[PDB]
Structures are given as structure tokens and as C-alpha cells.
From Swiss-Prot:
Residues recorded with modification (3R)-3-hydroxyaspartate: D19
Intrachain S-S bonds: C6-C17, C11-C26, C28-C37
List of glycosylated residues: S8, S16
Domain EGF-like, residue spans: 2-38
Record-given protein name: Factor VII light chain
Length: 46
């Protein structure tokens, strides 16, 4: 028990969710962005 942030599968874009001490880290595709992988960065836009 140490903060279940990945247990909720927040990593979107079908990325791999991994626990990293309390916080978490999503392993989405290299063309995606956002803390929970909620931004598709293919060109960059802004």
C-alpha cells in the first residue's frame, strides 16, 4: 500500500501504466503527451 495511482489505469492511448513510488508513469506511444496520456502530439501544433 503506497498510493494506488496506476490501479485506476489512468494511462490512456492504450499506454502501459507503471507504479513509481506514490506517483506513476504511463508508457504511451512516442506521438502522445499529457500526464495521463490525454494529448495526441503527432506534429506539435503549439
Amino acid at each position: 500500500s503506497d498510493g494506488d495511482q496506476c490501479a485506476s489505469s489512468p494511462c490512456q492511448n492504450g499506454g502501459s501504466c507503471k507504479d513509481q513510488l506514490q506517483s506513476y508513469i504511463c508508457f504511451c506511444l512516442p506521438a502522445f503527451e499529457g500526464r495521463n496520456c490525454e494529448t495526441h502530439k503527432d506534429d506539435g501544433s503549439a
